[PDB]
């Protein structure tokens, strides 16, 4: 059951470097590629993320795509950069210019065929292929346009597998780019049709995690990308280690998605605590469960108390009792019953894995399907309607070749997604 990862654009390549560092550390792979681990439990599932090259070496199943090689030279210069296969770096000669239309129509169609050849070469080598995993930002230029182009092509070529995405979306307060609403709206329109499961992260939530929970004095993008790499590496843990109650990406989708359009989820990771405080509190299932539902540890700006949970999933790593998990999930459902959708008799799925992440006795990652995600899309749609009524910067997109009808279609589709979430929020048994 092998996963193929795709990292696109600056954010994707930067998050990918830390993800592959975390994965290489847990399996004891040196930056030269040599296995140096100390237990057979590490070797027996190495195939899941690494292919074996001759005389000991392992190579990571990842495709790197970008329109300007600056980021690729930075990742090749990094401490683990050597592990990546040289033929897997694909780059052009001019930037996306923060424009969705360039990334989707002009340089996208020029490079996309070489990316499809690399993705097919990587997919057909697996004995059994599991879903793809993609990291990119929706606010950028090549990430949104070329990522969604490639997602559409892979969904045409492999419609029976799973499609999973991790995506960065613009903060309502911390904008980095003026034309963010257009790129975000077009990308969300593409994702809601093509994707099977989509996770959303706000940089503001990672800053609030660092300042309030970790009390870091001077955080850097390396810390934010480490938190993201930790949560990304945690969801797949039951695929690649033994446990008392195994779980899988398809089983997560079956328990989390009630209706096919409702596939947007919130993320959280529980054992976060400052270096000064850690000597004062031991790990236990109640402490992890209490932090896991605290909105302070949830990675989007929308708050759960303004919505309702349709479904949720918790994956536990470590040697621990199943009774405490079952009774904790029952207690949280019974005391806060108003925040759970009443026409589903049990909203939480649990899973237990024997091997915790290195240096922690136990850990849990949380995936949540909550209607409060509608608030982010509404904010993006308001800013889009303010900009679109006046054709504020539209000549760039029209000069690349886009018809105005795509903007009205993408706006209508996002408005219908917000309406469908709002209808399920206010649904009743009657």
């Amino acid at each position: 059951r092998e996963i193929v990862c795709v990292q696109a654009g600056q954010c994707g390549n930067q998050i990918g470097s830390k993800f592959w560092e975390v994965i290489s550390d847990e399996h004891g792979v040196d930056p030269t590629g040599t296995y140096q681990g100390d237990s057979d439990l590490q070797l027996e599932r190495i195939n899941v993320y690494f292919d074996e090259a001759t005389g000991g070496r392992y190579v990571p199943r990842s495709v790197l795509i970008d329109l300007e090689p600056g980021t690729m030279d930075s990742v090749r210069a990094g401490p683990y950069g050597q592990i990546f296969r040289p033929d897997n770096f694909i780059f052009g000669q001019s930037g996306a210019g923060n424009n969705w239309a360039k990334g989707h129509y002009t340089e996208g169609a020029e490079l996309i065929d070489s990316v499809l050849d690399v993705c097919c070469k990587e997919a057909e080598s697996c004995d059994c292929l599991q879903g793809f995993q993609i990291c990119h930002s929706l606010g950028g230029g090549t990430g949104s346009g070329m990522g969604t182009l490639l997602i559409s092509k892979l969904r045409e070529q492999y419609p029976d597998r799973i499609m999973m995405t991790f995506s960065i979306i613009p903060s309502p307060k911390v904008s980095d780019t003026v034309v963010e609403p257009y790129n975000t709206t077009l990308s969300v329109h593409q994702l809601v049709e093509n994707s099977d499961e989509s996770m959303c992260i706000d940089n503001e939530a990672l800053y609030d995690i660092c300042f309030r929970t970790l009390k870091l004095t001077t955080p850097t993008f390396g810390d934010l990308n480490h938190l993201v790499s930790a949560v990304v590496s945690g969801v797949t843990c039951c695929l690649r280690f033994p446990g008392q109650l195994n779980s899988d990406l398809r089983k997560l989708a079956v328990n989390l998605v009630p209706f096919p359009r409702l596939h947007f989820f919130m993320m959280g990771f529980a054992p976060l605590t400052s270096r000064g405080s850690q000597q004062y509190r031991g790990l236990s299932v109640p402490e992890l469960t209490q932090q896991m539902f605290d909105a302070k540890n949830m990675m989007q700006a929308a708050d759960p108390r303004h919505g309702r949970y349709l479904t949720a999933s918790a994956l536990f790593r470590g040697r621990m009792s199943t009774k405490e998990v079952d009774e904790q999930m029952l207690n949280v459902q019974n005391k806060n019953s108003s925040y759970f959708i009443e026409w589903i008799p049990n909203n939480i799925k649990s899973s237990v894995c024997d091997i915790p992440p290195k240096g922690l006795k136990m850990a849990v990652t949380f995936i949540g399907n909550n209607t409060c995600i509608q608030e982010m899309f509404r904010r993006v749609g308001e800013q889009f309607t303010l900009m679109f009524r006046r054709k504020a910067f539209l000549h760039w997109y029209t000069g690349e070749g886009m018809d105005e009808m795509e903007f009205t279609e993408a706006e209508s589709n996002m408005n219908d997604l917000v309406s469908e979430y709002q209808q399920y929020q206010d649904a009743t048994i009657e």
């Binding site: 109650l245 079956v254 049990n346």
Partner: protein
């Protein structure tokens, strides 16, 4: 003489590990399949034969199959300590799970794996001379256990016909829960299971957690404890075929005595001397005390209260140092009690069994060592309450087609939901009608 065990999915394989550990330790077979050099001498014996066969060089191999669609649990048994005991052909594993979808197991994925399972069962049945039934262990909450268990029981029922099939089934607990789609899988499994099973024993993890908290002193139990208790129950029921006793009980006698009508085959199970080592030496454990123990609902391994219904038949198996006169005195005292009631059409409500072999003690176990034990399986109308809550949960979820698109996309007609729900409605009405008093006809 012989019995074949079929283990399906995760719960069935993990319960199988505890069962085969116990059967090895009780007979004395080492984990590598042999016996000590001094255990061969003595009187000529074969009691292991019900569960093991010898090649002639003295290795033992067991009459079981382990079935799973994901490799992890079977790879764990293959790499564990009992590697040399099982034949590698016996451990069958697919590539990918049924993802909590009954439809994926039954229509799409189990159809490829089912023919290997039937070929292995055929290879076992050809090496027997007194096969007396199939024992099946599975959970109805998951996708592959429900779908492949139903498909395989249908094929076995066509090929072997009249041979008996007794099931140990883990049903969804009434408030502890593990997955969202449990009602759909349990209803669709139960529809197929109604036609193709002779007796079905129901277990709930919430009851075994309650029993481990009250009687044993364990604050944080895990599945190995529950699986060891289930293994003890299976050892108690199958002891009647393997050891001497005053009143033996063949596997056909359970089916003959417990099932009054062909659809009324779901039975409750309980076990008496669940006690810790520190408590066991301050108290006597006489026949009447454990007989009184088996009837309190705090002793049961299924979450139902029998005071809200009527018993139709009870089968009591005693193993160890017991004398028939004490069993008769105990049963007469139970019959005197006012909180125990039998349906008026079943005046002679009891079947007894008495075996001389006391229960075995497992090195890492939590039960004390005791000279006698009693185990009961009984048929009661209270079980109708278990189906009603699953049916209500199905109705709540199905009113909005909450997840149906997965099942219809993976190959199932929408009509199958309505058929299964109507069959379970008829089963509820059967349990309502059978419990109606025959008195006051004039």
């Amino acid at each position: 003489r012989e019995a074949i065990c079929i283990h399906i999915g995760q719960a069935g394989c993990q319960v199988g590990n505890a069962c085969w550990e116990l059967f090895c330790l009780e007979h004395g077979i080492q984990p590598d399949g042999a016996m000590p050099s001094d255990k061969t001498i003595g009187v000529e014996d074969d009691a292991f034969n019900t569960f093991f066969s010898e090649t002639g060089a003295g290795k033992h191999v067991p009459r079981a199959v382990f079935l799973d669609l994901e490799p992890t649990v079977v790879d764990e048994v293959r790499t564990g300590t009992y590697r040399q005991l099982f034949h590698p052909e016996q451990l069958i594993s697919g590539k990918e799970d049924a993802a909590n979808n009954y439809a994926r197991g039954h229509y799409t994925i189990g159809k490829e794996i089912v023919d290997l399972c039937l070929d292995r069962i055929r290879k076992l049945a050809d090496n027997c001379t007194g096969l007396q039934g199939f024992l099946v262990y599975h959970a109805v909450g998951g996708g592959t256990g429900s779908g492949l268990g139903a498909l395989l029981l249908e094929r076995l029922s066509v090929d072997y016909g009249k041979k008996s099939k007794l099931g140990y089934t883990v049903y969804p607990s009434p408030q502890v829960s593990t997955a969202v789609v449990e009602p759909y899988n349990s209803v669709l499994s139960t529809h197929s299971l109604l036609e193709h099973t002779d007796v079905a024993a129901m277990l709930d993890n919430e009851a075994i957690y309650d029993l481990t908290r009250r009687n044993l002193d364990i604050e944080r139990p895990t599945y190995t404890n529950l699986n060891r208790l289930i293994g003890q129950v299976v050892s108690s029921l199958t002891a009647s075929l393997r050891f001497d006793g005053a009143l033996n009980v063949d596997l056909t006698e359970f089916q003959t005595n417990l099932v009054p009508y062909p659809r009324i085959h779901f039975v409750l199970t309980s076990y008496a001397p669940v006690i810790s080592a520190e408590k066991a030496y301050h108290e006597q454990l006489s026949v009447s005390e454990i007989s009184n123990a088996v009837f309190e609902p705090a002793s049961m391994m299924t979450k139902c209260d029998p005071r809200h219904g009527k018993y139709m038949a009870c089968c009591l198996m005693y193993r160890g140092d017991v004398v028939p006169k004490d069993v008769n005195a105990a049963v007469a005292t139970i019959k005197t009690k006012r909180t125990i009631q039998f349906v008026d059409w079943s005046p002679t409500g009891f079947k007894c069994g008495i075996n001389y072999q006391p229960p075995t003690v497992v090195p890492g176990g939590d039960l004390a060592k005791v000279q006698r034990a009693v185990c009961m399986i009984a048929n009661s109308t209270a079980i109708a309450e278990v189906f009603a809550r699953i049916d209500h949960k199905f109705d709540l979820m199905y009113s909005k087609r909450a997840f149906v698109h997965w099942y219809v996309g993976e190959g199932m007609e929408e009509g199958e939901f309505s058929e299964a729900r109507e069959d379970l409605a008829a089963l509820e009405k059967d349990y309502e009608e059978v419990g109606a008093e025959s008195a006051d006809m004039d």
